Design a protein around this ligand. Structure first.
Ligand SMILES: CCCCCCCCCCCCCCCCCC(=O)OC[C@H](COP(=O)([O-])OCC(O)COP(=O)([O-])OC[C@@H](COC(=O)CCCCCCCCCCCCCCCCC)OC(=O)CCCCCCCCCCCCCCCCC)OC(=O)CCCCCCCCCCCCCCCCC
Ligand SMILES: CCCCCCCCCCCCCCCCCC(=O)OC[C@H](COP(=O)([O-])OCC(O)COP(=O)([O-])OC[C@@H](COC(=O)CCCCCCCCCCCCCCCCC)OC(=O)CCCCCCCCCCCCCCCCC)OC(=O)CCCCCCCCCCCCCCCCC
Ligand SMILES: CCCCCCCCCCCCCCCCCC(=O)OC[C@H](COP(=O)([O-])OCC(O)COP(=O)([O-])OC[C@@H](COC(=O)CCCCCCCCCCCCCCCCC)OC(=O)CCCCCCCCCCCCCCCCC)OC(=O)CCCCCCCCCCCCCCCCC
Ligand SMILES: CCCCCCCCCCCCCCCCC[C@@H](O)O[C@H](CO[C@H](O)CCCCCCCCCCCCCCC)COP(=O)(O)OCC[N+](C)(C)C
Ligand SMILES: CCCCCCCCCCCCCCCCC[C@@H](O)O[C@H](CO[C@H](O)CCCCCCCCCCCCCCC)COP(=O)(O)OCC[N+](C)(C)C
Ligand SMILES: CCCCCCCCCCCCCCCCC[C@@H](O)O[C@H](CO[C@H](O)CCCCCCCCCCCCCCC)COP(=O)(O)OCC[N+](C)(C)C
Ligand SMILES: CCCCCCCC/C=C\CCCCCCCC(=O)O[C@H](COC(=O)CCCCCCC/C=C/CCCCCCCC)COP(=O)(O)OCCN
Ligand SMILES: Nc1ncnc2c1ncn2[C@@H]1O[C@H](COP(=O)(O)OP(=O)(O)O)[C@@H](O)[C@H]1O
Lengths: 347, 98, 320, 122, 49, 459, 104
């Protein structure tokens, strides 16, 4: 693909997301989703390799179905009130349809099946974009209509996403499927606190985005998409594996790392609303994510796996293209807990 | 709600159901996507005409435009899949697992 | 400004650099033939950059200072001991073959980068496309296992598919007894232990497989020993070729941009040479890996990036 | 729910309203600012480490830019955070003042008059 | 020395160094001026000075 | 209190800017000086704590713990520099960084005024410990051990967090002074029962309590020497300190919720003490003696009396010193014969006479020979337990009898009898090992003359 | 090759006494090892162990034990002369206590 065409497709994806983010009319939000998907499909197929075609087809079918249910919910809401403004969604059937459409777009359980397949079928740069930028528009819509959201349905899907992401990650040797299941669990954490406090949802999204960017850039730096391929990196660039281990520990949510701040901030919020069982189950379930992060850390950094002879040749060459925002992303994803009160700047 | 509104909503539900329950051909599912778009067009046009919302009269046309972009997208993908397998069967899209 | 998407957006293309003199030319042939002198003379006549055959320490010459490194820190294989003991139980044979294929891949990437950045043609001795003739001869003589051949084929499948094969394939055909006599005359004590069956297998691989599928994408110029010394005839024979069979005329500025983005960044070129397939001949244990890597880092110009080594005369480091 | 998203008189994308100028600015020696500078210094060290340069002394101009950018952003971040907490306090006090029947002032007994149960430890 | 002359070497890219240092000092000067203005405005509004 | 924290933080850049052959010297000297500075916190008041600031305070319970924590770092550095000889320079500095970070986290943990900050530091102590165990342990089990260490702790402490932010939402604060002054009784309800369990089980797993003590014989055995030293001496006492701190909010609910834990402790004392009698691994025997000793601290904290609290403080300090010394003593033999089997190397008193004296003194303090502070703490807890119920004397008495049995057995197997004939690489003791033993044992004996310094806030 | 990889043999441990018969067991370098010994001994046994123990022994009586003994002596003397009880059953005065209304 031509670099100018790639640039304009990326700008169209971002423009669709921003159109969703600045619109007050439901039709413009729908148009933003459509425009985002239209430019998103060719980015997933940048390298042809039929697995990418499969991932693009699955993604298109899922997102088109979600768009249709979203439009139907918009029309039902209009029928029961001649309103186009995005507000508290005067009709409850329309609200259920809208919540299901947005849950399909985000990949919350049980609409979660597509995320591991599409992520495994695309490249690491496409996976980075899919797991970071694509969540902004649906979550920005959910923040706006959160007051009319039914807690029982949203929280059921949140608990299901946390459980399913934790269970699915345990069985994975491929790094992109591990990232997908981690994404499902973090989406569940984001949407569990949404009916209570949207500032906590935004804070969790930002911390998850910086952690995911750091992890994906570290996986791009060491061109590894499998556990065994990543296990060779200690013998070529030890610093990369050390930073990967610290980022994995942070993603696990262990204090005093940055990953801990969102969970700590969500549990507290849920306790102010007399929700005790829900945060306890969520916190205990996140230990599955921690386990399959610790297993990767064992494979890549805390022990040394056997290497190959040709690796010697790689000792003579340097990483040519540098990612300028990787150091900032690593520091932001690890050493940011002491500045937790700054979250008040998000409301 | 009159009987026509429920008939249009039932048409949308039948199409959504048709989309969800896959048979073999990919094109059969693209047709159900098109049907869902047609049902939405008719529903919104009926609501808009009934309440005499003049400005809203342009939104179904817009709704039609992005219907084509979604169809043209889908057909495009259907070409590539076929070029890989000589068949548009959804059974062949099993290289990636969960 | 290093070449990249931004330089492609603002102007620069590679199709404008090609002047019908690009002509990636490889000059193959069996051991101890005259292909080296033929290649140097062809590069001299045509004004093309010559590449001497990539050996064990080829990668050393392109990085740091061109001085070869210790065999422990570079290669970890011995051609001399492959001649001494071809069936050694320490895996030297396939380790040598796999390292040599990696070196040939790096050399091909360097040659392609030179051609795509300057427009000047390159002459090579062998390439990744003819490397396998040494592998087959190794396997037919019982020097390597079938798993080694499968690993070699796996590495070749995901690497050789990313490049354009040469325009011109020059083959120097010298029979087995003549190269045998040349070997006996040269004086190298290790090289005289090459059996006739080994050279016969190399020739069989060259003629049965390599040349036939090389000749279906571009014309192949075969020559005998006596007419190979006549370099001006070969050069004018190359001058009157009708290159319409290969994918080279089927290349656009975007495909050339992709290829050039690949041929720089040697780490991406060598990506799949170290795939986690654990064969004993090439797998190195964690303790030896750690020791040898620490030994490599202690080399005078290798601890840091090239411009940042205070102990090889670098200066103003604190301001770079 | 958004607690202050739609507070009356709020400018959509301001990041620093005019009324925030009534608050004392954070001192340049604020320990939070020093921690932002420390974060910038760590970012510079990691930048040297990834690029395979001498970690402590490779690029002093680059390390200085890291520290300066982190401190510069942190100053305004601290101003916004302090203003937002001041707004929360202002609204909470005003609401307590305007709803006296919801926050009734209670005359407090002394411990001599309160009867607490005693639970012996034995 | 090196085989390829390694273009970024003992003479550093002085334009980039100058830009980096200029940006750092410009940011610092702006920040000090901004803090002075903030203190003056805060004291003016609160009737302190 | 920053006069201790900041010098500890300066140990990191000092270690990273040191010469390749000077890291051990610099780290040892400056950690010893930090211990000297830490000794000033022993000047405690009789009525309230030393409230340094809104964030940090020191009490008569946390001051001896702080002193032991700072004193342990030089001993860990001395014990680590032998088996890390062939290590590269940067990995040596990384190991020392792990130890310094652990000390920093522990120092802040013991002095935090607010329970959420205490929780955050008490959980942060997991990362350096796990890295130490799983990166520098010697065998393949060290990975599994790490997992056992990680998930036993977290599964206990995740509810605790949920309890703590719950408490602040109802009482308004988690400051310990406010928590103590504004204390209110706990009603007898299911919600209060589960809040009691959430506040207690996290600390119970750290002790550990018999039943959830499985992680300990793995983690202590597979860890390197400094890892096991810090795990036994300080990390086990985090549970005791936290339970002592959090018990105030718990009353009067503790009177009936303590029964299952008292039964588990008073029976698991016997169970683990008897397990020590049939243990083929010497380091595993030393590890199990720790569970047997901490059961007594659990009993003392649950029965909630001034004599029991004094005894628990004294026993925690004495056990820290004695268990660290025993782990070092076993490591001296391991670095000779490279096996932890107790019967592999015998008759060592003949070949290593002074290390045998060290072994004898460590075994004597392990079985609480009077007037050692081991005995002081044990006897105070036994007297308080007798007040709680006379029948306890039977269980307590039985434990004492068993503890002496496996201690001297450990002494007789490794030091007496005849040396195995085949082993011939048993070199004379180094000055480093002898000094490491002396710096363990001399403070222990010196604490006998001033026991009020280790008897806690109830003295 | 019936081996699964190329690996170094496991090396035998080094005896520090072979090259430094008075080795102290701190380091391979004799000078660095000797200074490690001297610095550990001086800063552990001479500074922290002796001076720290002396400092702790002479700590001032901030626990107020002698003060409490003096106050107790004063009150025992005062009460005995007076004929008042040596100790009082109730710490807090009854007059300042407001019990609930009635016993039923
Ligand atoms: C609550 C407050 C906080 C909010 C937080 C918000 C969210 C935060 C971030 C969320 C997550 C972000 C994730 C980003 C993923 C991006 C994916 C990606 O690029 O790949 C990774 C990429 C991989 O690189 P690689 O694989 O090594 O490179 C190989 C190439 O890909 C090989 O490819 P090639 O050979 O083709 O190379 C081409 C290359 C080289 O580039 C070129 O050569 C340039 C050529 C120029 C061509 C010009 C064409 C112009 C014609 C097109 C016009 C289109 C119009 C569209 C609009 C239509 C409107 C109707 O171009 C690129 O690589 C990508 C170009 C990117 C273009 C960006 C376009 C922006 C559009 C903005 C849309 C919004 C507009 C307003 C809309 C209003 C509503 C309507 O590396 C990274 O990006 C690392 C991560 C970077 C993330 C940045 C960190 C976050 C942001 C930090 C800065 C501050 C942010 C906050 C700002 C606050 C406001 C001021
Ligand atoms: C409440 C806490 C308060 C304080 C916070 C402290 C925590 C850390 C600090 C904050 C984060 C720092 C990040 C920046 C450092 C990154 C650079 C680096 O990688 O180090 C290599 C570098 C050595 O490179 P070189 O010396 O140039 O040449 C040797 C070669 O590079 C040879 O190098 P090589 O690459 O060939 O060696 C291979 C090695 C290379 O592997 C590494 O280098 C590991 C790097 C660690 C990654 C750090 C992740 C990001 C930070 C997250 C920390 C989380 C904190 C929470 C607690 C959990 C801790 C894990 O790989 C391995 O050995 C595999 C071992 C795997 C073990 C897994 C554990 C790794 C994570 C542990 C991190 C702990 C802190 C690191 C300490 C600094 C080092 O170390 C340094 O020299 C820099 C260290 C710090 C510089 C100090 C300069 C200051 C000068 C004094 C100023 C005085 C101030 C007062 C003024 C007034 C005075 C009068
Ligand atoms: C009542 C005694 C009066 C003592 C007068 C003052 C003496 C002060 C000594 C303080 C202790 C020194 C630190 C211990 C490590 C020694 C370092 C060393 O290796 O020396 C080798 C050195 C050179 O010999 P070598 O030929 O190279 O040795 C080669 C082999 O190692 C072969 O060596 P070995 O076979 O000769 O073994 C060494 C020897 C000696 O080594 C040791 O056992 C030292 C540790 C003693 C046991 C402590 C652990 C048991 C728990 C109780 C802890 C009590 C602490 C009291 C406060 C201590 C303050 C520092 O072993 C024994 O004699 C049997 C030890 C079992 C003692 C049984 C009695 C226990 C209760 C005694 C009463 C305690 C309270 C007294 C006050 C009561 C009311 C008036 O030998 C000596 O210089 C003699 C060692 C000192 C023996 C003292 C035994 C009585 C200690 C009583 C406690 C201190 C009380 C002081 C106040 C007055 C009472
Ligand atoms: C891991 C830490 C997070 C890193 C985040 C990225 C760091 C780079 C900062 C991004 C730069 C852009 C922000 C400032 C530029 C102008 C901001 C202004 O234009 O926008 C205002 C908004 O200001 C921003 O919200 C403040 C951005 C500050 C982000 C930092 C908070 C991080 C949380 C604390 C973690 C510790 C981080 C410390 C960093 C080291 C308008 O407010 P408003 O339109 O009405 O709110 C919209 C959303 N509502 C209505 C739904 C509420
Ligand atoms: C191996 C190490 C594990 C750690 C050990 C932890 C031990 C936890 C045990 C908790 C102690 C007591 C819990 C609750 C107190 C009483 C429980 C019950 O048995 O007593 C009766 C409770 O009544 C009934 O029995 C209800 C309980 C029956 C259902 C619970 C099942 C318990 C079976 C044991 C499960 C194993 C526990 C460990 C799980 C891994 C009391 O009679 P009642 O007057 O009516 O209730 C008064 C309580 N009020 C005031 C709150 C109302
Ligand atoms: C090798 C040969 C061995 C035998 C030969 C040796 C010769 C004999 C030497 C041994 C002396 C025997 C001791 C006899 C007792 C006399 C000492 C006694 O008088 O001193 C005590 C004083 O001891 C100190 O109080 C105890 C020292 C504290 C120990 C701290 C260790 C240093 C820190 C190391 C870190 C370890 C971590 C610890 C964690 C808590 C008395 O306390 P006190 O009743 O008041 O004094 C009254 C007068 N004052 C109050 C005015 C001072
Ligand atoms: C290594 C293994 C260690 C295991 C430790 C796990 C046990 C921890 C104890 C339970 C944890 C959850 C407790 C929740 C925190 C308490 C806060 C609280 O007070 O909330 C209660 C609510 O309490 C609960 O909901 C807790 C119910 C249990 C939910 C999760 C079940 C976990 C399993 C229970 C049994 C296991 C506990 C003992 C096992 C010991 C370890 C083997 C009352 O609040 P309100 O709703 O406002 O009531 C007043 C107004 N209506
Ligand atoms: N790909 C290879 N595999 C194994 N051995 C090789 C390979 N390439 C070259 N050699 C050996 O290197 C030596 C020189 O190669 P050759 O082409 O035969 O002679 P020259 O290039 O010097 O004219 C010979 O001993 C040859 O066998």
């Amino acid at each position: 693909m031509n670099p100018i065409i790639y640039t304009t497709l990326i700008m169209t994806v971002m423009s669709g997301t921003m159109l969703v983010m600045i619109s007050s009319h439901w039709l413009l939000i729908w148009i933003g989703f459509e425009m985002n998907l239209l430019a998103m499909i060719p980015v997933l197929m940048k390298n042809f390799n039929p697995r990418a075609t499969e991932a693009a087809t699955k993604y298109f079918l899922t997102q088109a179905t979600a768009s249709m249910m979203l439009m139907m919910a918009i029309i039902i809401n209009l029928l029961y009130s001649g309103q186009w403004t995005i507000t508290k969604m005067f009709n409850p059937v329309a609200m259920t349809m809208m919540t299901m459409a947005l849950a399909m777009k985000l990949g919350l359980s049980p609409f979660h099946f597509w995320v591991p397949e599409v992520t495994q079928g695309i490249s690491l740069q496409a996976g980075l974009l899919l797991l970071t930028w694509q969540k902004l528009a649906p979550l920005s819509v959910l923040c706006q209509i959160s007051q009319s959201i039914n807690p029982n349905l949203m929280l059921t899907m949140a608990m299901l996403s946390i459980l399913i992401g934790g269970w699915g990650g345990l069985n994975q040797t491929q790094l992109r499927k591990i990232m997908a299941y981690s994404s499902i669990a973090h989406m569940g954490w984001m949407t569990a606190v949404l009916p209570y406090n949207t500032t906590m949802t935004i804070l969790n999204l930002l911390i998850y985005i910086t952690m995911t960017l750091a992890m994906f850039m570290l996986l791009i730096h060491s061109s590894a998409t499998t556990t065994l391929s990543l296990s060779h990196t200690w013998n070529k660039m030890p610093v990369i594996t050390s930073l990967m281990m610290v980022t994995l520990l942070s993603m696990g949510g262990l204090p005093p790392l940055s990953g801990f701040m969102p969970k700590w901030m969500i549990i507290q919020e849920m306790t102010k609303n007399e929700s005790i069982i829900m945060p306890t189950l969520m916190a205990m379930t996140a230990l599955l994510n921690l386990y399959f992060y610790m297993r990767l850390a064992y494979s890549s950094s805390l022990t040394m796996f056997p290497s190959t002879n040709n690796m010697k040749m790689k000792w003579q060459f340097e990483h040519t293209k540098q990612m300028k925002l990787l150091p900032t992303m690593i520091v932001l994803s690890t050493l940011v807990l002491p500045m937790t009160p700054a979250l008040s700047s998000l409301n | 709600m009159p009987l026509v509104y429920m008939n249009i909503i039932m048409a949308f539900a039948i199409a959504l159901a048709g989309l969800l329950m896959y048979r073999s051909h990919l094109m059969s599912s693209l047709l159900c996507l098109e049907g869902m778009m047609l049902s939405l067009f008719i529903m919104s046009t009926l609501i808009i005409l009934n309440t005499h919302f003049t400005l809203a009269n342009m939104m179904p046309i817009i709704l039609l435009v992005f219907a084509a972009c979604e169809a043209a997208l889908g057909l495009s993908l259907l070409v590539m899949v076929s070029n890989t397998y000589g068949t548009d069967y959804v059974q062949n899209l099993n290289l990636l697992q969960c | 400004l290093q070449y990249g998407p931004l330089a492609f957006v603002l102007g620069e293309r590679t199709t404008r650099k090609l002047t019908e003199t690009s002509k990636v030319i490889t000059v193959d042939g069996n051991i101890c033939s005259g292909k080296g002198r033929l290649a140097r003379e062809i590069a001299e006549k045509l004004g093309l950059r010559h590449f001497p055959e990539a050996g064990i320490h080829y990668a050393d010459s392109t990085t740091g200072d061109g001085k070869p490194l210790d065999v422990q820190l570079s290669g970890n294989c011995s051609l001399e001991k492959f001649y001494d003991d071809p069936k050694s139980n320490d895996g030297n044979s396939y380790r040598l073959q796999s390292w040599l294929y990696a070196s040939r891949l790096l050399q091909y990437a360097d040659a392609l980068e030179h051609l795509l950045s300057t427009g000047q043609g390159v002459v090579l001795e062998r390439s990744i496309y003819s490397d396998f003739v040494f592998l087959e001869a190794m396997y037919r003589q019982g020097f390597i296992r079938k798993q080694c051949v499968e690993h070699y084929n796996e590495v070749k499948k995901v690497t050789a598919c990313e490049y354009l094969p040469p325009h011109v394939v020059v083959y120097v055909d010298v029979p087995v007894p003549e190269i045998q006599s040349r070997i006996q005359k040269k004086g190298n004590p290790h090289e005289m232990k090459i059996t006739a069956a080994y050279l016969q297998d190399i020739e069989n691989a060259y003629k049965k497989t390599f040349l036939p599928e090389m000749s279906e994408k571009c014309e192949v110029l075969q020559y005998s020993a006596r007419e190979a010394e006549d370099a001006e005839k070969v050069v004018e024979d190359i001058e009157y070729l009708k290159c319409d069979k290969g994918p080279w005329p089927d290349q656009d500025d975007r495909t050339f941009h992709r290829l050039r983005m690949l041929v720089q960044n040697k780490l991406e070129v060598l990506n799949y040479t170290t795939i986690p397939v654990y064969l004993p001949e090439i797998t190195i244990g964690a303790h030896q890996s750690d020791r040898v890597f620490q030994k490599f880092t202690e080399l005078p110009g290798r601890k840091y990036s090239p411009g940042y080594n205070e102990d090889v005369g670098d200066k103003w480091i604190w301001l770079k | 729910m958004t607690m202050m998203s739609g507070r009356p008189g709020r400018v959509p994308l301001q990041f620093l309203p005019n009324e925030a100028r009534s608050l004392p600015p954070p001192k340049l020696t604020d320990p939070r600012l020093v921690y932002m500078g420390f974060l910038g210094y760590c970012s510079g060290l990691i930048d040297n480490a990834i690029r395979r340069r001498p970690v402590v002394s490779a690029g002093l101009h680059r390390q200085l830019l890291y520290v300066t950018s982190f401190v510069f952003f942190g100053y305004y971040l601290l101003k916004r955070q302090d203003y937002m907490y001041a707004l929360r306090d202002h609204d909470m006090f005003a609401y307590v003042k305007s709803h006296p029947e919801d926050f009734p002032e209670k005359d407090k007994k002394t411990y001599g008059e309160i009867l607490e149960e005693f639970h012996p430890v034995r | 020395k090196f085989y390829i002359r390694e273009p970024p070497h003992g003479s550093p890219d002085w334009l980039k160094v100058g830009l980096t240092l200029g940006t750092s000092v410009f940011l610092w000067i702006y920040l000090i001026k901004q803090h002075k203005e903030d203190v003056l405005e805060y004291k003016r509004r609160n009737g302190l000075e | 209190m920053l006069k201790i924290i900041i010098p500890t933080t300066m140990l990191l850049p000092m270690t990273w800017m040191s010469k390749h052959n000077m890291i051990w010297i610099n780290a040892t000297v400056h950690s010893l000086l930090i211990s000297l500075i830490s000794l000033s916190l022993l000047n405690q008041l009789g009525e309230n704590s030393l409230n340094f600031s809104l964030t940090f305070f020191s009490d008569s319970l946390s001051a001896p713990l702080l002193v032991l924590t700072t004193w342990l770092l030089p001993l860990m550095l001395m014990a680590s520099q032998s088996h890390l000889s062939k290590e590269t320079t940067t990995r040596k500095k990384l190991y020392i960084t792990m130890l310094i970070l652990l000390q920093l986290f522990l120092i802040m943990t013991f002095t935090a005024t607010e329970l959420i900050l205490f929780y955050i530091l008490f959980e942060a102590t997991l990362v350096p410990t796990l890295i130490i165990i799983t990166r520098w342990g010697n065998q393949t089990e060290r990975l599994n051990a790490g997992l056992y260490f990680l998930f036993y702790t977290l599964a206990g402490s995740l509810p605790l967090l949920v309890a703590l932010v719950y408490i602040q939402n109802t009482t308004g604060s988690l400051n310990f002074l406010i928590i103590h002054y504004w204390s209110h009784p706990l009603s007898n309800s299911w919600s209060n029962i589960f809040m009691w369990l959430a506040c207690i089980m996290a600390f119970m797993v750290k002790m550990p309590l018999y039943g959830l003590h499985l992680w300990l014989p793995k983690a202590h055995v597979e860890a390197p020497i400094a890892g096991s030293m810090v795990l036994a001496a300080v990390l086990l006492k985090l549970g005791g300190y936290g339970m002592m701190r959090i018990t105030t909010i718990l009353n009067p609910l503790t009177n009936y919720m303590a029964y299952p834990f008292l039964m588990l402790s008073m029976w698991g004392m016997i169970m683990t003490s008897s397990i020590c009698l049939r243990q083929t691994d010497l380091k595993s025997l030393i590890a199990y003696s720790s569970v047997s000793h901490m059961a007594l601290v659990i009993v003392a904290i649950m029965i909630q009396t001034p004599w029991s609290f004094m005894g628990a403080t004294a026993l925690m300090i004495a056990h820290g010193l004695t268990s660290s010394m025993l782990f070092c003593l076993a490591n001296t033999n391991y670095e000779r014969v490279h096996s932890r089997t107790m019967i592999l190397a015998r008759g060592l008193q003949t070949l290593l006479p002074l290390m045998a004296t060290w072994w004898l003194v460590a075994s004597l303090t392990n079985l609480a020979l009077p007037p050692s502070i081991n005995l002081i703490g044990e006897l105070f807890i036994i007297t308080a337990s007798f007040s709680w119920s006379n029948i306890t004397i039977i269980l307590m008495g039985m434990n004492m009898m068993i503890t002496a049995l496996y201690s001297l057995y450990m002494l007789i197997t490794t030091q007496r009898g005849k040396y195995t004939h085949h082993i011939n690489n048993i070199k004379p003791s180094f000055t480093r090992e002898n000094a490491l033993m002396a710096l363990h044992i001399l403070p222990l004996l010196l604490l006998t003359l001033n026991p009020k310094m280790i008897l806690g806030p109830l003295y | 090759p019936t081996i699964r990889l190329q690996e170094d043999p496991d090396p035998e441990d080094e005896n520090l006494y072979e090259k430094n018969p008075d080795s102290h067991g701190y380091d391979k370098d004799p000078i660095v090892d000797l200074w490690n010994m001297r610095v550990v001994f001086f800063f552990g046994f001479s500074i922290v162990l002796v001076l720290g123990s002396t400092f702790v022994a002479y700590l001032p009586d901030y626990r107020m034990q002698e003060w409490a003994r003096r106050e107790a002596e004063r009150l025992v003397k005062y009460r005995e002369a007076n004929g008042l009880p040596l100790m009082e059953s109730n710490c807090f005065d009854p007059n300042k206590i407001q019990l609930p209304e009635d016993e039923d």
